[PDB]
Design a binder for these strands. Structure first.
Ligand SMILES: [Mg+2]
Ligand SMILES: [Mg+2]
Ligand SMILES: [Mg+2]
Ligand SMILES: [Mg+2]
Ligand SMILES: [Mg+2]
Ligand SMILES: [Mg+2]
Ligand SMILES: [Mg+2]
Ligand SMILES: [Mg+2]
Ligand SMILES: [Mg+2]
Ligand SMILES: [Mg+2]
Ligand SMILES: [Mg+2]
Ligand SMILES: [Mg+2]
Ligand SMILES: [Mg+2]
Ligand SMILES: [Mg+2]
Ligand SMILES: [Mg+2]
Ligand SMILES: [Mg+2]
Ligand SMILES: [Mg+2]
Ligand SMILES: [Zn+2]
Lengths: 99, 86, 56, 122, 49, 137, 97
RNA sequence: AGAGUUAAAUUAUAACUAAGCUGUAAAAAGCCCUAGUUAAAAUAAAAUAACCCACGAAAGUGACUCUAAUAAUCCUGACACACGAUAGCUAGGACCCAAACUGGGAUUAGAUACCCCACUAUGCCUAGCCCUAAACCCAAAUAGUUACAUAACAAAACUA
């Protein structure tokens, strides 16, 4: 039986380190007419805009590539006890699964 | 007075219109803050009034820049919601 | 009122070797003439603790 | 160096310019300055017209004298260079090579402040 | 180290004999402290003009 | 067409002419725009006064001369008297902030005169003389 | 006996602190160009921290060095010196829109 | 705390031009020894920097340079000692500009007020007093805690 510290040591998210400038492949699970809701698998879905090139082949279940900056967008404003999560992630589109 | 003339606070017109150069000059004085300086130096303000005005301006600037930061943070959530009638 | 000489050769530059073979220009620069008031204060403080104190 | 003399002189020719510099440096040596070197920045048109010794000047030469001087004779130097008429503006500052550059290690990002107000419900 | 530095700095000091030659050299050799700084933090010298 | 806002420096070798004369040869229109009056004076490059007008000289009276229309008529009349003495281009300088600033500039434009440069020379004290006390005590 | 527990070490991924434009540099009152880059060309005013973007130490040293040059007669007051007009722009203020 | 200096204005006073200048929601009074431009001493005050938060015990201090310098191997402590914003007092000097008082002009039933014009003490320096403030950050000093815990509001509650 494996201990949980061993699983944290060998999890891919621990191997990620910094959340800035990381190339992560993700999967689109919901289609809004200009908005792509992409579950890259970490914690939250990110929202991207449909690009002007090859915009027809971004559908449900499509795998894309992302460059992560913040895994969860969250900030403090004055007069707030707790931070303000947006319940999203920040990532931009590079392309879709070049194979 | 002792300085060289016509170098400072001077703009030149382009292609024969002067109103555009005038709004350019007014933007220069506006970002440099000289316009409010001439408005506030028409009369004399006491140092107590000066301190109150600076405190009010600093408080308003802090609140406005932090509120604009919150608007810029929440601007990406203005999209149409995907889960209507869930 | 004790009187430090102008050629006192202030506190930080006393114990280094090879001073008296160096010419009058550097000795004049390192003396109390172009020193500040605080260097003279350190000189008076050192001389006074060596005058009155038991274990400096 | 210890002191630095920002010395703006009257715009004039080479021999009386050198003579004025000569008597300025002997005036420094009479009060007891140990001068390191002399610097010329050339002659330039002044930023503004400066009234000195019943005259209005627009062009002038810029000179620098750095020296070690006792703290009591700086007033005598300033008095003599005020009475000198071939100089338009003398000023004596502490030389910037006396102080050493303390470290800019970077800009520390300041957190937004917490706990300014109570946890009452508005 | 400072007294050895001040030993070699005293050789170029202006004296009564050295004053004429130093005035003549300084009036013939101008030098400027001017330099500019860039957005990347690099120093640009106007001596290349 | 690279155009620079900054003036053609007298010490520079910049080559810009307006009707054959250099930049500092062009006459000057001093525009003192106060909160109750606007006084307009065109003077030569050697600071010889060519013509003068004001809102009081244009037949307006006390509250009437503080408005912009009086400054506009003053600019038209001053440009007419400048054209009568025979000047085409003028460098205009504005002293003080008033309601007749726009009106004075466009009156000098519409009165048959050409402007090439506007300089705002407003008296800004570096905490100098103390001004008068504030109203509504 | 569990070797998979984390160690109490500091953060290894601390990217170093961002630096000012003149950071580990030396300011002066004799160089007119460097002092005059941080000055408005039309009016001669001194830009603040939100336009200049320095450490507070260097912002104070630039302010003192400018004002010393203003009094001592090395640089103009009412205008930027036009010989150094075409210097590269480090400030973030945009005058033409 | 001394000593030295003046950039932006402003002014005494001259030279050209004009018959008007100032004044407000609107007007009158005042000035026409006036107004604009160009030259400029003396005095007073120190834009921007400052969206900075430092120094001093507090009052207070942000134009520049130099000098001297910011107690205590650091607990509390008076009716003792030493300071103490502005306003005010005696003597000498300075007086650009502001201005209590006062005199005019508006407004009002009245206006010895709010609005406008001019001027005095005064605001400045030297020397001596006066020892007062919403001197308030209405939160005493020195060591500490986030345990118990919300009269209300405000700047959270508290131990020695
Ligand atoms: Mg002056
Ligand atoms: Mg008055
Ligand atoms: Mg009251
Ligand atoms: Mg004194
Ligand atoms: Mg009348
Ligand atoms: Mg006088
Ligand atoms: Mg100032
Ligand atoms: Mg202490
Ligand atoms: Mg005690
Ligand atoms: Mg008192
Ligand atoms: Mg008094
Ligand atoms: Mg008086
Ligand atoms: Mg009356
Ligand atoms: Mg107080
Ligand atoms: Mg009380
Ligand atoms: Mg107590
Ligand atoms: Mg309730
Ligand atoms: Zn830095």
């Amino acid at each position: 039986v494996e201990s949980f510290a061993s699983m944290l040591r060998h999890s891919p998210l621990t191997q990620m380190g910094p959340a800035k400038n990381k190339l992560v492949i993700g999967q689109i699970f919901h289609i809004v007419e200009d908005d792509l809701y992409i579950d890259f698998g970490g914690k939250f879905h990110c929202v991207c805009k449909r690009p002007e090139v090859d915009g027809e082949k971004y559908q449900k279940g499509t795998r894309v590539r992302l460059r992560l900056l913040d895994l969860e967008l969250t900030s403090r404003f004055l007069g707030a006890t707790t931070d303000t999560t947006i319940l999203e992630a920040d990532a931009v589109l590079l392309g879709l699964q070049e194979s | 007075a002792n300085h060289l003339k016509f170098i400072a606070r001077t703009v030149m017109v382009q292609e024969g219109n002067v109103e555009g150069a005038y709004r350019t000059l007014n933007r220069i004085l506006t970002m440099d803050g000289l316009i409010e300086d001439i408005k506030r130096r028409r009369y004399y303000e006491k140092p107590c009034r000066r301190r109150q005005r600076e405190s009010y301006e600093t408080c308003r600037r802090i609140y406005n820049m932090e509120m604009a930061r919150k608007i810029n943070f929440l601007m990406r959530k203005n999209r149409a919601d995907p889960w209507q009638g869930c | 009122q004790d009187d430090p000489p102008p050629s006192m050769l202030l506190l930080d530059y006393q114990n280094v070797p090879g001073i008296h073979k160096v010419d009058d220009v550097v000795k004049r620069l390192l003396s109390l003439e172009m020193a500040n008031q605080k260097e003279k204060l350190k000189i008076k403080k050192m001389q006074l603790m060596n005058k009155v104190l038991e274990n400096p | 160096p210890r002191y630095e003399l920002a010395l703006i002189l009257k715009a004039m020719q080479r021999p009386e310019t050198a003579a004025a510099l000569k008597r300025t440096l002997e005036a420094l040596m009479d009060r007891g300055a140990v001068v390191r070197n002399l610097e010329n920045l050339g002659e330039r048109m002044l930023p503004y017209k400066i009234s000195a010794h019943n005259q209005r000047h627009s062009r002038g030469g810029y000179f620098l004298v750095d020296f070690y001087a006792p703290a009591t004779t700086v007033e005598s130097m300033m008095e003599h260079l005020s009475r000198d008429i071939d100089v338009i503006r003398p000023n004596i500052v502490k030389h910037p090579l006396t102080q050493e550059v303390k470290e800019c290690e970077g800009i520390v990002p300041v957190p937004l402040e917490e706990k300014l107000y109570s946890t009452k419900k508005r | 180290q400072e007294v050895l530095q001040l030993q070699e700095e005293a050789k170029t000091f202006i004296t009564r004999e050295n004053l004429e030659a130093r005035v003549e050299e300084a009036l013939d050799s101008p030098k400027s402290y001017n330099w500019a700084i860039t957005r990347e933090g690099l120093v640009v010298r106007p001596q290349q003009k | 067409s690279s155009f620079s806002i900054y003036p053609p420096i007298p010490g520079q070798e910049n080559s810009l002419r307006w009707a054959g004369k250099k930049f500092e040869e062009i006459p000057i229109a001093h525009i003192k725009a106060s909160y109750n009056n606007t006084q307009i004076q065109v003077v030569s490059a050697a600071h010889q006064p060519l013509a003068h007008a004001s809102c009081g000289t244009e037949g307006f009276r006390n509250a009437k001369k503080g408005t912009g229309i009086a400054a506009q008529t003053a600019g038209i009349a001053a440009a007419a008297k400048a054209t009568g003495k025979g000047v085409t281009h003028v460098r205009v300088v504005v002293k003080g902030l008033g309601p007749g600033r726009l009106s004075a500039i466009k009156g000098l434009t519409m009165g048959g005169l050409e402007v090439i440069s506007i300089t705002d020379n407003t008296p800004i004290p570096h905490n100098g003389c103390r001004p008068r006390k504030a109203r509504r005590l | 006996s569990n070797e998979d527990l984390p160690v109490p070490m500091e953060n290894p991924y601390k990217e170093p602190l961002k630096k000012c434009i003149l950071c580990e540099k030396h300011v002066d009152y004799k160089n007119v160009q460097l002092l005059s880059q941080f000055i408005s060309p039309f009016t001669g005013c001194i830009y603040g921290r939100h336009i200049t973007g320095l450490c507070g130490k260097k912002q104070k040293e630039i302010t003192k060095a400018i004002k010393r040059a203003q009094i001592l007669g090395f640089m103009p007051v009412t205008y930027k010196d036009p010989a150094y007009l075409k210097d590269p722009k480090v400030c973030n203020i945009k005058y033409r829109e």
